[PDB]
């Protein structure tokens, strides 16, 4: 039957950002990478089989694939190849995604607003939002 996580489920295109560069300036992301990756439009593609959360992001810079269980740490070779540890949990309906590697800690939250899926990174001060719509 349903799942709250239903509404993420679907194929998802990036139509808007907003600081993405800085945020990849606050991570560590080199100047090359950040100006293909800040070019990228990708799509990300959601499912869900049982208790396992599939999420795609799929561009012209990078194909990545995570599958995860909510709370349940697992090891993420991010698109700007980032070795982290990551838990993503529901916190009221928002998807938070932690990723923490050499003393440092990330946070990605994901939510349903309207038709859109906004995606919020967090990297100390610096936030970046992305804007994806259905497919
Ligand atoms: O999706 C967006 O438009 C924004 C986030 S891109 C992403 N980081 C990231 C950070 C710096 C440079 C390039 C990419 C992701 C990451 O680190 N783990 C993910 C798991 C699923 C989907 C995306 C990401």
Not at 8 to 25: A, C, H, I, Q, R
Not at 72 to 90: G, H, M, P, Y
Request: hydrophobic share 35%; with cysteine.
């Amino acid at each position: 039957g349903s799942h709250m996580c239903d509404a993420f489920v679907g194929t998802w295109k990036l139509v808007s950002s907003e600081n993405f560069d800085d945020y990849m300036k606050e991570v560590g992301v080199g100047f090359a990478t950040r100006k293909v990756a800040g070019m990228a439009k990708p799509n990300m593609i959601i499912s869900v089989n049982g208790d396992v959360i599939t999420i795609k992001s799929e561009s012209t810079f990078k194909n990545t694939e995570i599958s995860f269980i909510l709370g349940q740490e697992f090891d993420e070779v991010t698109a700007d190849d980032r070795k982290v540890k990551s838990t993503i949990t529901l916190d009221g309906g928002v998807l938070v995604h932690v990723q923490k590697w050499d003393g440092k800690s990330t946070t990605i939250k994901r939510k349903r607003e309207d038709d859109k899926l906004v995606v919020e990174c967090v990297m100390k001060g610096v936030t970046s939002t992305r804007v994806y719509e259905r497919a």
